[PDB]
Design a protein around this ligand. Sequence first.
Ligand SMILES: *[C@@H]1O[C@H](CO)[C@@H](O)[C@H](O)[C@H]1NC(C)=O
Ligand SMILES: *[C@@H]1O[C@H](CO)[C@@H](O)[C@H](O)[C@H]1NC(C)=O
Ligand SMILES: *[C@@H]1O[C@H](CO)[C@@H](O)[C@H](O)[C@H]1NC(C)=O
Lengths: 50, 50, 51, 265, 111, 128, 51, 125
Amino acid sequence: GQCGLLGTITGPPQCDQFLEFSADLIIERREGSDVCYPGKFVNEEALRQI
Amino acid sequence: GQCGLLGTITGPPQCDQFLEFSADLIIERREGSDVCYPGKFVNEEALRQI
Amino acid sequence: SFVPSPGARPQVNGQSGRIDFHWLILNPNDTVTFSFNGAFIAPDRASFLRG
Amino acid sequence: GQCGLLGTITGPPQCDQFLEFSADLIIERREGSDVCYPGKFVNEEALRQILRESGGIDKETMGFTYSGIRTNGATSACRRSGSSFYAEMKWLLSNTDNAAFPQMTKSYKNTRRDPALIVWGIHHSGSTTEQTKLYGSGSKLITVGSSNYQQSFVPSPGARPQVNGQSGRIDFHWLILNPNDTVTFSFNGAFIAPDRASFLRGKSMGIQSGVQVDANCEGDCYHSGGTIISNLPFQNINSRAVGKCPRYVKQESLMLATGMKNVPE
Amino acid sequence: IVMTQSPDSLAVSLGERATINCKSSQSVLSGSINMNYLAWYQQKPGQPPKLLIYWASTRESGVPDRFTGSGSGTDFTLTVSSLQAEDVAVYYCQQYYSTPLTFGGGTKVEI
Amino acid sequence: AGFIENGWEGLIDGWYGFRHQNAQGEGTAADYKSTQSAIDQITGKLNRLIEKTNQQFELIDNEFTEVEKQIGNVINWTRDSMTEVWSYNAELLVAMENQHTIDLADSEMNKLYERVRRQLRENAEEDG
Amino acid sequence: TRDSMTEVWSYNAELLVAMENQHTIDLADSEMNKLYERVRRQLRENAEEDG
Amino acid sequence: VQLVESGGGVVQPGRSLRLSCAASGFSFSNYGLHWVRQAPGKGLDWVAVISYDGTNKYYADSVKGRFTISRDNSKNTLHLQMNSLRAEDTAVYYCAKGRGPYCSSSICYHGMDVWGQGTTVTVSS
Ligand SMILES: *[C@@H]1O[C@H](CO)[C@@H](O)[C@H](O)[C@H]1NC(C)=O
Ligand SMILES: *[C@@H]1O[C@H](CO)[C@@H](O)[C@H](O)[C@H]1NC(C)=O
Ligand SMILES: *[C@@H]1O[C@H](CO)[C@@H](O)[C@H](O)[C@H]1NC(C)=O
C-alpha cells in the first residue's frame, strides 16, 4: 500500500505494519514511499530485487 | 559531422552549429568530439541514449 | 555530491586540467540547488527534450 | 589452482608460477585467491573478463624511480619466508617513520602497439595512526590522469575486520592505456604503485572449473562440471557452458525419431 | 642441456632478413605456464650485453620491433627486419628452464 | 503405414519389403531403392541437425565471486529467457522433425505402394 | 546478449528456410499429385496410368 | 637502473679474492641476482645464481663446490667469494639481476634484464 519495499528494511511510519513481514507474494504500489526523512538508497534496484 | 551528439549540450566550437536542433534522425561520426576542454562524462552512454 | 581533485594530468588538447560533466534529468515542478564553494562549471542554459 | 585470475596482475605468493603465463584456455578455481594482502578489485568482473580474453599476459617495466623514499613494503600476511608484498606492485611507505610524503608525479607512456593494462592500489590503514606511521599526516589525495581515465580518489583510514591477518584494505584500481597514450599518477601518500604494466598477448577463453585438467579430448566448451564433448545440438548439463558447443535446454532428454513409427504384431 | 647456435657471422647488407637459429638439446617449454623459457641477448664490443627479448617472444620496451623472436619446443629463431649501424653486435640464446644456465656460442653480425 | 494391420518383425536388413505367399512357397524379401531414399533423407536431416554451433560464447557471470546484484540479475534473466526460448525451439524442432520423419516413412511406403500398383495395371489389385 | 540473439535468429532463419523449402517442394508434389488424381478421376476406365 | 662493481684486478692462481657488486635505483631484496662471466673473444658463461632470500643457491658445473655467492639486503650489496682460481677464469664478471619480481614462476634462475659494467680479472702465469 502506502509502504515501499525498501521502507520495510528501514521503517518509515507508513511501513510500520510490514516491518518484519513474511509472504510468498510481495505487492508494491506507486503510492508506496520508501522513506519519511528525504533520501535515496544507493544501488536501489539491487536491494529491491534482493 | 566533426561535432558530437553530447557536444550539442555543452557547446564546444565544433558543436556550435548543432547546439540546439530538431530532427527525427541523429547521425554521429567517429571524428565527432564531444569536448573542447578535456574531460569525460559520468553516465556517458546513458546521456548519449537520452 | 563530489569534491574537485587537482592533480597533474597529461596534456590532452594542449591542456592539463580536466572538467567532468555530471548530469541529471528534472521532472516537471522540480528544482535543483547547486551549492558550490568553488571550482564549478555552472550551467548557463538548461537542455530540454523535444520529441 | 590456488592462484586467482586477477592475482596474475598483482602477484600474491599463490600467483608466482602464473605471473607471466600464455594460454588459449585459462582455468580458474574456487580456492584461487586474488589477494594476499586483504583488498578488492573495483569494477571486478570487467577486469576478469578482460583477463579471460588476454591469451596470457606480458609484463613490461615502468621505470618508476623513487629516490630518498623507502619502497620495500612488507606484510605479515603476504608472506613466504619473510615479510614481503606483491610482485608487480611497490608499496610507497614513508622514509623511516612518521614523516611528510612528497607529492610524487610519475608518468608512464604506453609505447607498445597494443593497449596496456595498468593496475594500481590504494591503501586504507586499520587506523589513522597507522596511516600516519606508514605515510604521514595530512589529507592524502591521489589523482590518476590519462586521455580516457581521469578518476581520482582519497584514502579513508579506519577500523576493519581482521581479514587474512591484516586490518587495512588495498583497493585495486585499474585502467587500459591506448598505444601512445600516457598515464600520470600524482600521489602524496598511501599508494601501491604498479611496477610492471600488463600487456595482452592474444585471444583466450577463460573457464571456472573444479575438475582436474586432462589432455585427451578435442573439447570445445567447458564449465564447472567439466567438458561437454558432443556433436548434438542441445545439452542439459550446465546452462553456463563457455565455448562453441550445444545449447542449454530445460528438457531432461529429447528423443529425435530416426526410424519409422513401428507397430508390433 | 646445451644451447647450440647457428652458423657463424653472415655478410648480410643493410635491410636484409637477418636470421639467427638456436637449437636445444631438451625442451624448455613447460606445460604449466606455456611461456617457453628462453632469452636473447645482444652484446656491443666493449659494452655489457643488454637483453633484447625475453621468454623467446616478449619484446622489451628498449628495443625496436625489428627483432622478432619465433619460439618452438626445440628450434628458435630471431629475425631482424632491417639492419642499421646500431644493430651490429654478437647474439646469444640463454635457456633458463633448467640449471645450468647455458648461453649460446655467439652469433656476430656483419653489415 | 495407415492401412497395414501391423508391421513385419522378421524384416531386418531393410525398411520396406515384400511377402510372397505364392505357389512356390512363402518368402520374405527387402526392397532397396525406397529404403535407401528414406535412410538418405533421414540421415541428411540428422547431418543438418547434428552440428556443433560456430558461435563461441564467453563467460559472462562468475560462479565463485558473485557479481553486482542488479547486473547479475539482468544476466540471470537474460540467460533464463534464452534458456526458455532454446527449450521451446528444441521441443518445436524435435516434434516437427519427428512428425516429418513419420510422414516421410508413410510417404515412402505410399510411393512404393503406388509404384507397385502402377507397375501392375490390372494384373493385381489391393485388398486394404 | 546480441550474440545470443544473433545465434537464435540465425537458427530460426535457417530452420525457417529449410522447412518452407520442404513445404514448397511438398506443395509442388501435392499439386502435381492432385492434378494427376483429378485426371485419373476424369478418366474412369477409358484411360489408365503408366507409372 | 644500474649496478656498480668493484674488486677486479690481477690475482695469482689459487689465491683468494673478493668481488662485490653494489646496486641502486631499485629494490635489491626483491629481484634475483646472477653472476656471469665473458671470456675475451669467447661466448658468455654463467657462474652462479642467488635467490631473493639467499636460501637457494645454484652454481655452474665447472665452479661447483669452488665459489660461493652471498648477498646482504641491508647493505645493498652482492658478494662473490673467490677460492682456488685457475687459468681459464680470465674473464670479465657481470652481476646482472634476474628478470623476476621476488623469484616468481617455476624457476628462480631467471634471465637478465640489466647488466653491470663488468670487472675484468686476469691471472698471471
Ligand atoms: C506545477 O505547478 C503549477 C503552478 O504552481 C501548477 O499549475 C501545476 O498544476 C503543477 N503541476 C504538477 C504536476 O504539480
Ligand atoms: C604514437 O607513436 C607511434 C610511434 O611512435 C605512432 O605510430 C602513432 O601514430 C602515434 N600516435 C598517433 C595518434 O599518431
Ligand atoms: C544465476 O544463475 C546461476 C545458474 O545458472 C545461479 O547459480 C546463480 O545463483 C544465479 N544468480 C542469481 C543472482 O540468482
